[PDB]
Design a protein around this nucleic acid. Structure first.
Ligand SMILES: [Mg+2]
Ligand SMILES: [Mg+2]
Ligand SMILES: [Mg+2]
Ligand SMILES: [Mg+2]
Ligand SMILES: [Mg+2]
Ligand SMILES: [Mg+2]
Ligand SMILES: [Mg+2]
Ligand SMILES: [Mg+2]
Ligand SMILES: [Mg+2]
Ligand SMILES: [Mg+2]
Ligand SMILES: [Mg+2]
Ligand SMILES: [Mg+2]
Ligand SMILES: [Mg+2]
Ligand SMILES: [Mg+2]
Ligand SMILES: [Mg+2]
Ligand SMILES: [Mg+2]
Ligand SMILES: [Mg+2]
Ligand SMILES: [Mg+2]
Ligand SMILES: [Mg+2]
Ligand SMILES: [Mg+2]
Ligand SMILES: [Mg+2]
Ligand SMILES: [Mg+2]
Ligand SMILES: [Mg+2]
Ligand SMILES: [Mg+2]
Ligand SMILES: [Mg+2]
Ligand SMILES: [Mg+2]
Ligand SMILES: [Mg+2]
Ligand SMILES: [Mg+2]
Ligand SMILES: [Mg+2]
Ligand SMILES: [Mg+2]
Ligand SMILES: [Mg+2]
Ligand SMILES: [Mg+2]
Ligand SMILES: [Mg+2]
Ligand SMILES: [Mg+2]
Ligand SMILES: [Mg+2]
Ligand SMILES: [Mg+2]
Ligand SMILES: [Mg+2]
Lengths: 252, 52, 121, 233
RNA sequence: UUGACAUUGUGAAGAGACAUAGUUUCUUUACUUAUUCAAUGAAGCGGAGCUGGAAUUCAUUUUCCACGUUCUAGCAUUCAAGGUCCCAUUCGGGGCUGAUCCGGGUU
RNA sequence: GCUUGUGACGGCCCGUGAAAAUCCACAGGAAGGAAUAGUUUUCAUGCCAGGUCGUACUGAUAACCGCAGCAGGUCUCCAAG
RNA sequence: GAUGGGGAAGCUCCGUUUCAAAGGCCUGAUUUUAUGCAGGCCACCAUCGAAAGGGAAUCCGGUUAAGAUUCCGGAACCUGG
């Protein structure tokens, strides 16, 4: 039978992102000489909405150390940062909201955003509205630093991974009921063509593992194996448990 | 604007037809004060160095 | 002694000697003769009754004219072939796919006079 | 002094555009440059087998200078010189009757890789020079061994082009002597001696020595400072 | 997906046989040039040095950190002004220094 | 009043509602410039030039698509009492 | 959607600034002379893609069997020189 929906997504026909209005990519400064020996001053010139993003961006402009001109960067705004504020990026910089510092130079318990997985990848962890990561350790020999990611996972990276002090702005966005179909609509209209969602169980067998039957039903466990193959993986992929979760989660 | 005489494209003051007067007022004060306060910073830390 | 001193970190393709063509035989033996002389430019009079009217009332010579040729070329070729001064030249493509030039002469000339001197009426 | 002023300039991060410097250490050379450099580098990081690396050990400038000085006399005929010699013999022989021997028995350097080889095999060379370059090295790798077993004195000399200059070819791979005027026989035994002392005599020992295994200096210093501190506190 | 072989090299400790000389083979953990991944109009790397100074001297230095910017929504560009050497004093212009050395491994 | 245009406002958003050519301005001060006469065309007036192709008409119960002068279908502007 | 490229037996597939030695402006130096070198830049890397998006500049009157913001009349405007 037919190619199921989640297999057609990969060719990205109608499925690519809706991009026309976005401000640009959000990235930290290129880890140049200034930022890894000292610090460098900037000014947030504007903090601004990015279409299809939770959290506002911050246009922050700096001086080029090598040419007479202004090079402007796009940050994800931490809560608190403001138009006019001065932002300091660099190893030898100070510990206030908005600045960007290598995880090495921040005491444990420091709370930073947009952190790199390797130094200089211009920012990769905790970028979503609300999210952040907490430094929980340091190992000065082989300068690693340990952090707790938003998920809950703990990871270790180079102490030269840069982060930015604070949490990402616009948090709490997800507490407000969408209330109606049209708001989800306009929501994904600026994201990607993933909405609405026909249930596989309302389809015909050509369409889905779940299709068909004189009543609507999955007709076999909906926990599919990792080893499964494209056209098979709909349902609870590799699910190691299932059912209503009881009692406090929170990783130990 | 290329069919119009340059007086239609400026006012006389420094940063004529580019910035809004009050704004120039402002950056002038800031410029003066910072450059002054700058000198303050230098003779104060010159003092630190020979009195420590 | 010692090395160069590039102050830019981008290396560029050296500006090297561009030599000009000095053949060894010719392109085509005999240059083409002028592909669009005045005689080829301006094809015939147009003597439709309504065209005749533009000649009597407008001081306009109406010619069928080479498709290949432009307003400059039409003007100069009339100027040259008919001893006449020209004010402006409008053109259009007819629907049998041929080009008509309305040619306005300057106020010194009487195109109507000039019509029966080329010899049509 | 005048109405002129000393202003200096602060280039210490976060102020004053950096000035122009020599970024030659940083420029992004064309791939072809990059490749020929790293060929040199990769070629030393690897431990190179003793039948290569007997090269790299080249004859020294002084001895070599003396070893060109000699040879440079014995260049092969010039094009004109042969034209000249022909007409000399073409005329004089065919009439004055001479046995195609109104030419003197010539002494020049012997060259071309294939030529020189069979000369060595026939114990006719007395001094073989082998270039240190030569890119398909195989062309020439067996020559030390060859000479040594034919009991022929040799030397690996800097410059395949320079072996070329003395023979009017762009390059010449190898250059050899087999003949010599009695006036030069002397300095040849002398030349040969030094030369044997640096190569043929040192051959069997060189043959046991691998080469390369050499760190770049960023990771030389790494271990020069790791090995200084660790052991001797 | 899992194994083997090939790409596949260099140390070091440890096991494993001719049966307790080291040619060889795997466990560990080192190395970088293969291979791999990021970055940047391949800009400031690695090493030494100047200065400061914490430091305590068991002869004197045995070291370790530093070694131009943080009240302000300004300004920062013409190989840099200064200093110094040249051209034969013209206007123009050129070294050096300012900005320390050594290695060309962009990081 | 009606249609349209425009202004200063206000509601809305987990939606905050293109790009580039192109034009101007400003910061900068390389430079070039007067008294025996220099500088100035962003002030006025004055001279020359402006190619190529389309341009008719229909746009619908007969000029388009539906075998056709088919009760079907086919994007829009103007709008009196 | 070409291009240094990388795939593919191959028709061709991928890449679009991408692991590329990618290109050109201002005038100076010429008074053998027509344009070599002298600087200093600028490193933007094709191109096609809108007769509703962006966009230099024209209006009234008159005129035809059938054209008209297009001709005639008058009166303007923009762009280049
Ligand atoms: Mg199928
Ligand atoms: Mg996309
Ligand atoms: Mg949908
Ligand atoms: Mg559902
Ligand atoms: Mg559903
Ligand atoms: Mg159904
Ligand atoms: Mg099925
Ligand atoms: Mg199934
Ligand atoms: Mg079913
Ligand atoms: Mg059910
Ligand atoms: Mg004004
Ligand atoms: Mg001024
Ligand atoms: Mg008349
Ligand atoms: Mg026309
Ligand atoms: Mg001779
Ligand atoms: Mg394995
Ligand atoms: Mg780099
Ligand atoms: Mg309307
Ligand atoms: Mg708005
Ligand atoms: Mg303007
Ligand atoms: Mg100048
Ligand atoms: Mg004007
Ligand atoms: Mg033209
Ligand atoms: Mg019409
Ligand atoms: Mg009709
Ligand atoms: Mg029809
Ligand atoms: Mg009909
Ligand atoms: Mg393509
Ligand atoms: Mg186009
Ligand atoms: Mg258009
Ligand atoms: Mg348009
Ligand atoms: Mg007519
Ligand atoms: Mg009509
Ligand atoms: Mg009219
Ligand atoms: Mg008119
Ligand atoms: Mg007029
Ligand atoms: Mg003009």
């Amino acid at each position: 039978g037919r190619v199921i929906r989640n297999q057609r997504k990969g060719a990205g026909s109608i499925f690519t992102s809706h991009t026309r209005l976005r401000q640009g990519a959000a990235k930290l400064r290129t880890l140049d000489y200034a930022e890894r020996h000292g610090y460098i001053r900037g000014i947030v010139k504007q903090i601004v909405h990015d279409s299809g993003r939770g959290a506002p961006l911050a246009k922050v402009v700096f001086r080029d150390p090598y040419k007479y001109r202004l090079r402007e960067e796009i940050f994800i705004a931490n809560e608190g940062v403001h138009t006019g504020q001065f932002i300091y990026a660099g190893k030898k910089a100070s510990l206030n909201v908005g600045n960007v510092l290598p995880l090495g130079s921040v005491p444990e318990g420091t709370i930073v955003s947009n952190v790199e997985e390797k130094p200089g990848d211009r920012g990769a962890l905790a970028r979503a509205s609300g999210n952040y990561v907490i430094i929980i350790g340091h190992n000065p020999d082989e300068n690693k630093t340990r952090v707790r990611l938003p998920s809950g996972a703990k990871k270790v990276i180079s102490s030269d991974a840069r982060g930015v002090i604070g949490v990402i702005a616009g948090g709490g966005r997800v507490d407000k009921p969408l209330l109606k179909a049209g708001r989800a609509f306009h929501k994904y209209r600026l994201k990607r063509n993933s909405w609405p969602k026909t249930r596989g169980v309302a389809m015909n067998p050509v369409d889905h593992p779940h299709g068909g039957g004189n009543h609507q039903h999955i007709g076999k466990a909906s926990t599919i194996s990792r080893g499964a193959v494209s056209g098979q993986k709909a349902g609870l992929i590799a699910a190691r448990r299932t059912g209503l979760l009881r009692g406090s989660q929170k990783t130990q | 604007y290329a069919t119009v005489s340059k007086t239609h494209k400026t006012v006389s003051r420094a940063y004529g037809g580019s910035r809004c007067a009050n704004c120039v007022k402002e950056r002038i004060i800031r410029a003066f004060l910072i450059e002054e306060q700058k000198i303050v910073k230098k003779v104060v830390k010159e003092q630190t160095e020979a009195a420590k | 002694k010692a090395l160069k001193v590039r102050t830019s970190a981008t290396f560029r393709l050296p500006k090297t000697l561009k030599l000009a063509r000095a053949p060894k035989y010719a392109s085509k033996a005999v240059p083409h003769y002028n592909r669009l002389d005045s005689y080829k430019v301006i094809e015939q009079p147009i003597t439709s009754e309504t065209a005749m009217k533009k000649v009597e009332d407008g001081n306009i010579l109406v010619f069928q004219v080479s498709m290949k040729a432009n307003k400059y070329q039409i003007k100069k070729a009339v100027k040259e072939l008919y001893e006449v001064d020209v004010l402006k030249v409008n053109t259009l493509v007819r629907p049998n796919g041929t080009k008509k030039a309305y040619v306005r002469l300057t106020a010194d000339y009487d195109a109507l006079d000039i019509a029966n001197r080329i010899g049509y009426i | 002094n005048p109405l002129t002023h000393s202003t200096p300039k602060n280039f210490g991060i976060g102020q004053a555009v950096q000035p122009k410097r020599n970024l030659s250490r940083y420029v992004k050379w064309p791939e072809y440059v990059r490749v020929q450099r790293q060929k040199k580098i990769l070629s030393i990081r690897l431990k190179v087998p003793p039948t290569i690396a007997q090269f790299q050990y080249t004859l020294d400038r002084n001895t070599a200078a003396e070893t060109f000085k000699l040879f440079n006399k014995y260049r092969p005929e010039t094009a004109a010189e042969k034209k000249e010699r022909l007409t000399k013999e073409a005329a004089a022989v065919a009439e004055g009757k001479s046995k195609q021997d109104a030419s003197p028995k010539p002494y020049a350097v012997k060259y071309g890789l294939n030529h020189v080889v069979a000369l060595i095999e026939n114990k006719k060379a007395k001094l073989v020079l082998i270039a240190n370059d030569v890119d398909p090295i195989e062309l020439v790798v067996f020559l030390p061994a060859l000479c040594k077993k034919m009991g022929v004195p040799y030397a690996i000399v800097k410059g395949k082009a320079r072996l070329g200059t003395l023979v009017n070819q762009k390059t010449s791979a190898v250059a050899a002597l087999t003949e010599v005027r009695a006036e030069d026989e002397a300095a040849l035994a002398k030349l040969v001696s030094t030369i044997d002392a640096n190569f043929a005599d040192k051959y069997d020992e060189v043959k046991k020595h691998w080469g390369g295994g050499i760190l770049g200096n960023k990771a030389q210093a790494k271990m020069d400072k790791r090995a200084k501190n660790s052991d001797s506190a």
